[PDB]
Design a protein around this nucleic acid. Structure first.
Lengths: 52, 122, 105, 191, 58
RNA sequence: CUCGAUGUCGGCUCGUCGCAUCCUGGGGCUGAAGAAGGUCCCAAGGGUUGGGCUGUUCGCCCAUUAAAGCGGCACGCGAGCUGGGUUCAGAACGUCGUGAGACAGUUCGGUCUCUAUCCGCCACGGGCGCAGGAGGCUUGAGGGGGGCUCUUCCUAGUACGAGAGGACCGGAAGGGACGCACCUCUGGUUUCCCAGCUGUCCCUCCAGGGGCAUAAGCUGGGUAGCCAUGUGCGGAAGGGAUAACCGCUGAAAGCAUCUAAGCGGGAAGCCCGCCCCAAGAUGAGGCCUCCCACGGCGUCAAGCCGGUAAGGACCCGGGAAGACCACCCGGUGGAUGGGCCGGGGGUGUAAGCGCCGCGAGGCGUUGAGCCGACCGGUCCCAAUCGUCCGAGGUCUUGACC
């Protein structure tokens, strides 16, 4: 994928994946993805695998 | 995780909305309701009297907790939310339908019923 | 905190000026490494390096003085550019086993 | 020396089939010093110098098979401990020190409305009026960090030599890496 | 606010006994490097400057 | 006994007994088949949950559970809180009183004090001891820790059973509270490590910084150690002596009787076993590995001196070792600190120049820069040189060379 989108990344040959309601999702990564993303609009996201 | 009066929504339709957590079901001591687990709480509020109704003595189980569940697969999983499903003494749901995904779990501790109803089980 | 630094600061400062002062055991034991460390930077020697060293010390004269001045007299070794020497006596009322330290020379 | 033992490698988990965390342990054969027997009279420890080079800087199976390696010349490679086994190890607590009746000993402290009142840590009480002064009962700020700790059901998973070393099933060696580890599988229950 | 205070004349005896475990122990000092004399085990001095390097006065 | 004064209710915490035992095992009983109850004898090990409303305990109610015990110790605990409350003056009502005041009727609010001496407890050092002087290793008498449990499965839906049900016996698995230990995985830390920021003073103008804005001014983040929300693990076997309780062999009662004598059965319980000390258990224990008889003085001079690095120490340098102390490793024939150096980790691509847009900025060089303890090299630095103390081998008896 791309930490869902968070093109950064973090935590070994395992990692981990957060998640939201509605069969929707959020595979995941670092404390730079999280919080931010968990609170607005992905599009606008830069740094990473979006505003790449 | 999830006891006294921590609240959690529905994903099925039983006719609920959210529910307060009385006891963690199992036996004495015990202090925790983790998906798969089964809770002894009630309605904090439920639709316009579908079939349940606000403030209704209840029985529900575990399927969504942002407490993060460590998968024997040294893996990790969690959710943006915390809620579960009602039940008929017979570990049997009511909501005819599901909502947000869930986790293998259930299966492991009995419930298929939802296991599949679920839009997606993670 | 802000004090740990400050110290290292003025001490690092004063020192380079003389190259061996009189503070107690520890005090010295540290002003070393640091100050020390700093050195190793005068050694690096450049835009950056300087922009640091100074960053703390704050002061052309020196800052430069060392980077150029001493730095060299050291360009060769491997850290240690300081020889922390304990002392014989002790500040009064107190009774603190002060000590002296210099730039190994 | 009746047993087998060495020091703490460290911990980490990884692999398996579901996955599982253990700990590494260092120790070839720390030679063989005499051997336990109270024969003809009182016998226990001799010393026919054959040790290191520094050591004078300070100068019936278990023990038995020993005879095997302790007469060989001294040393004795460790590892019967094989594939899937339960010895037991006795670490050394951990210079944790003298602490409050808090962690030292489970206990609830200064509640709320007074769970702060620049108040806090400090036991509740000692003894009643009539009973009698005190008991040797209620612990105290009973220092820790030095205890001769250990445990049980110590299952070893695997081992290999490259350097004689052992992989463990759940670490909790007690003491810290580079620490003094001694193992055994005492009155095992999982047997 | 004297909750707790002694309760029985401390007993000279004891008292002192207490003050007993106390005691000094002369500076372990050694003798000059070449300074010739007695110095603070490990240091130059108003007799030295040496050690190996003349880092002092007199 | 106490008024030259023992601070009283409930709560909190920390608990400790006891058994008439609530849960838990073992039993005999039943109008007990099963299953589940009832009855009573034996056993306290361990254990016996969240809320509610009430100052309360008590108590009723809510959801659990195997269970959700009775009572001791001034209905334990104020020199340990609580301090609501009954129990200072206010002041209120109601209430009696000509009144004044008043009330186990009520209602608002109303100053619980830093320095433990002794005994006592938990802890760590100092002696002095254990009669050569010496470092290393073990025994444990005797103490202390811990012991609980639900549920799920085959045996089996077979015994029983008209049926709806549901076994001893025998065996898997999971989980609950709990405790020991431990960072790997997880999560909380991260007072400066790294990054973005607005206000300001110095900085030289720009840039590039600097304190202060707590003791970091603010925000994002963050090893290593500590630490749970998290990791292993544990409460078991089994051995012996019993309760109650069940039997055998058989008197006295030529017939019976667990019975005095003889022999066995039988418990979460005692003893042992499993961990945790531990001979200062003055009965100072064992054992191995070192040291050898030095000086001169009136004596059973077991008294004064060089010693033996056997040996230790002190001083230095260091430790998840740590209040001090004691305890551990090192002391330049060293890698012990720091230093440097690679390595990892961490922050998100720097200072500069460059190239696009009036500017703001961007894009590049550049996953840059900068890096606090984490893994490991290298004598740059700093553990130089030096002291002190330390044995000799007490008396009797005998066993062997």
């Amino acid at each position: 994928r791309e930490c869902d989108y968070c093109g950064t990344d973090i935590e070994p040959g395992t990692g981990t994946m957060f998640v939201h309601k509605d069969g929707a999702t959020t595979h995941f990564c670092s404390s730079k993805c999280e919080n931010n993303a968990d609170l607005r609009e992905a599009r606008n996201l830069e740094w990473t695998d979006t505003a790449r | 995780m999830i006891q006294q009066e921590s609240r959690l929504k529905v994903a099925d339709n039983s006719g609920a909305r959210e529910v307060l957590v009385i006891k963690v079901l199992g036996g004495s001591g015990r202090r925790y309701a983790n998906i798969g687990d089964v809770v002894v709480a009630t309605v904090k509020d439920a639709t316009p009297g579908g079939v349940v109704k606000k403030g209704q003595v209840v029985k529900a189980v575990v399927v969504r907790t942002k407490r993060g569940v460590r998968r024997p697969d040294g893996s990790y999983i969690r959710f943006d939310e915390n809620a579960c499903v009602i039940i008929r003494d017979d570990k049997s749901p009511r909501g005819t339908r599901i909502f947000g995904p869930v986790a293998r779990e259930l299966r492991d501790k009995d419930f298929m019923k939802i296991i599949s109803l679920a839009p997606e089980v993670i | 905190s802000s004090h740990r630094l400050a110290l290292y600061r003025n001490q690092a400062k004063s020192l380079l000026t003389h190259g061996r002062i009189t503070t107690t055991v520890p005090k010295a034991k540290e002003l070393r490494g640091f100050v020390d460390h700093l050195i190793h930077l005068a050694k690096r020697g450049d835009l950056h390096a300087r922009r640091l060293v100074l960053r703390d010390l704050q002061d052309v004269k020196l800052v430069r003085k060392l980077f150029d001045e001493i730095a060299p007299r050291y360009r060769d070794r491997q850290g240690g550019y300081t020889r922390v020497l304990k002392l014989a006596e002790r500040r009064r009322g107190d009774g603190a086993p002060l000590a002296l330290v210099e730039l190994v020379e | 020396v009746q047993g087998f033992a060495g020091y703490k490698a460290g911990m980490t988990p990884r692999e398996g089939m579901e996955t599982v965390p253990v700990t590494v342990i260092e120790t070839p054969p720390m030679r063989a010093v005499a051997l336990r027997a109270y024969e003809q009279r009182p016998l226990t420890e001799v010393w026919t110098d054959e040790f290191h080079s520094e050591l004078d800087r300070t100068l019936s199976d278990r023990l038995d098979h020993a005879l095997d390696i302790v007469e060989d010349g001294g040393e004795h490679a460790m590892n019967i401990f094989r594939a899937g086994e339960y010895a037991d190890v006795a670490g050394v607590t951990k210079g944790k020190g003298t602490q409050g009746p808090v962690k030292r000993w489970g206990v609830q402290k200064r509640k709320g409305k007074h769970a702060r009142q620049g108040w806090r840590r400090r036991i509740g009480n000692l003894g009643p009026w009539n009973p009698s002064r005190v008991r040797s009962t209620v612990p105290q700020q009973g220092q820790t960090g030095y205890h001769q700790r250990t445990e049980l059901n110590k299952r070893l998973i695997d081992i290999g030599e490259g350097g004689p070393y052992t992989l463990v099933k759940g670490s909790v060696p007690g003491p810290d890496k580079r620490l003094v580890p001694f193992f055994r599988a005492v009155r095992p229950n999982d047997q | 606010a004297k909750h707790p205070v002694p309760k029985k004349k401390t007993s000279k005896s004891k008292r002192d006994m207490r003050r007993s475990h106390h005691a000094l122990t002369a500076p372990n000092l050694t003798e000059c490097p070449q300074c010739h004399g007695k110095k603070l085990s490990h240091h130059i001095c108003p007799n030295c400057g040496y050690y190996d390097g003349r880092q002092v006065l007199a």
